[PDB]
Structure formats: C-alpha cells, structure tokens
Amino acid sequence: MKEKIRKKILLAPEEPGVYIFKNKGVPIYIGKAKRLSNRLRSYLNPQTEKVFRIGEEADELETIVVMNEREAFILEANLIKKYRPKYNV
Ligand SMILES: [Mg+2]
Ligand SMILES: [Mg+2]
C-alpha cells in the first residue's frame, strides 16, 4: 500500500463517512463507515484477498465526512451507482 494512503488511513477521524479508493483518477472501491478510522484501519490487516487488492491497487484514497449514518448510507449508494467501481459487487 502506498505510504500516503497508510498515512491517510491512520489520520482518518472517528466520524461517519464515505471512502473512495481510486487508481489513476478512477474509483475502484467505495464504502461507508460509522467511524472512518475504524473501518479504514481494517485495510491495513487484510482479512480477504479483495481487501488486499483494493489497498495495493489504489494510488489515492478520498474520504468524505458526513453528517450522520443516514447520510453515509445514501451517499455511498449514490456514488456506487454513479461510478460502479471495479471492486464493488
Ligand atoms: Mg459498502
Ligand atoms: Mg442518523
């Protein structure tokens, strides 16, 4: 994983949000979190091959802090629909 992404993960707030791993400007995985910190840190110790791939392929990680879990739910759904990222089913 790129060092800048590891850094961003470790700095991420304990706040609801949506996260977007990207490669060459293209989202490759979009997810949501009740706490960005907790969810993003899970990528550092990959529990699945897919998690491993997402973290290795990415050259950028964008985070969007949201008002609450309700906003996380709909923002995530909308962005997945818009971008249909590689690693989202
Ligand atoms: Mg999701
Ligand atoms: Mg709420």
UniProtKB/Swiss-Prot annotation:
Disulfide bridge map: none
Protein name: UvrABC system protein C
Functional description taken from the UniProt entry: The UvrABC repair system catalyzes the recognition and processing of DNA lesions. UvrC both incises the 5' and 3' sides of the lesion. The N-terminal half is responsible for the 3' incision and the C-terminal half is responsible for the 5' incision.
Organism, scientific name: Thermotoga maritima (strain ATCC 43589 / DSM 3109 / JCM 10099 / NBRC 100826 / MSB8)
Subcellular location: Cytoplasm
Family: Belongs to the UvrC family.
Signal peptide: none
Ranges where the GIY-YIG domain occurs: 14-89
Subunit: Interacts with UvrB in an incision complex.
